[PDB]
Amino acid sequence: QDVVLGLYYMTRDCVNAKGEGMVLTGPKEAERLYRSGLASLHARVKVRIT
């Protein structure tokens, strides 16, 4: 009930947040970017995943 409202909030998307349209280099670069205070938790980015 509550761990599903955390997954939902994390994996939505706004239309104009901090750090929008930039390009990342993997999941270790996004978590290191959001916890640093730069990019919002749901901004439309482009990453590289294997």
């Binding site: 750090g19 280099t25 270790k28 290191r32 730069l38």
Partner: protein
């Protein structure tokens, strides 16, 4: 008055860029006040060197596409943004890359200078197809503190860039990922003790245990004018 210091500090080494330190037993509530002031120093204020801008002599825009390479221009910049380069003495050094042949352009094909020292030769920068033997650029490494996206300097860029001066995201700090986790532990009569469990990677240039050490120095020196 008389506090509790940690003993039985274990550190586990796996995949030398990686490392997972544990530590205990810290006082009640000293798990978060300690590990969180450390995570803020590794991510935001930690000296390092990384490329900042490139000069593709054959391309003049970040969205264009260069001949012979199987890849794009954007996915080229993703490669250089992760190039682990440690320079010894200076603060600005402008390396040049010029490759011929058929295949992937590894990292060792760059020129080498008197103090600059790459730390991965088999890092692929771009796959070069046949008939060309043609690729050229200028990579610009410089020192700094923390992490600085390419969006903020372009918003206020006074260092004029001619047409064809790409701006690559500069990540200076040597830590790639860092995240602690606090948990319970006892001292044979106290159930409310803490046990900080750090866990950190790095981009090759510095071992993890050497990053946690030189980070606590940056934080233990700010308090230089209070402690006695």
């Amino acid at each position: 008055t008389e506090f509790l210091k940690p003993r039985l500090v274990d550190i586990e080494q796996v995949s030398s860029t990686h490392a997972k330190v544990t530590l205990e037993p810290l006082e009640r509530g000293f798990g978060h006040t300690l590990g969180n002031a450390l995570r803020r120093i590794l991510l935001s204020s930690m000296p390092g060197c990384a490329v900042t801008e490139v000069e593709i002599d054959g391309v003049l825009h970040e969205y264009s596409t260069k001949e012979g390479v199987q890849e794009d221009i954007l996915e080229i910049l993703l490669n250089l943004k992760g190039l682990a380069v440690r320079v010894q003495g200076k603060d600005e050094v402008i390396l040049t890359l010029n490759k011929s042949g058929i295949g992937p352009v590894t990292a060792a094909d760059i020129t080498h200078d008197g103090d600059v020292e790459i730390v991965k030769p088999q890092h692929v920068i771009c796959h070069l197809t046949d008939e060309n033997a043609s690729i050229s650029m200028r990579i610009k490494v410089q020192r700094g503190r923390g992490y600085v996206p390419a969006s903020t300097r372009i918003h206020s860029e006074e260092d004029e860039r001619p047409i064809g001066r790409l701006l690559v995201d500069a990540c200076y700090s040597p830590v790639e990922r860092i995240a602690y986790n606090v948990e319970a532990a006892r001292v044979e009569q106290r159930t409310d003790l803490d046990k900080l469990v750090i866990e950190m990677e790095t981009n090759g240039t510095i071992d993890p245990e050497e990053a946690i050490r030189r980070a606590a120095t940056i934080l233990a020196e700010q308090l230089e004018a209070f402690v006695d």
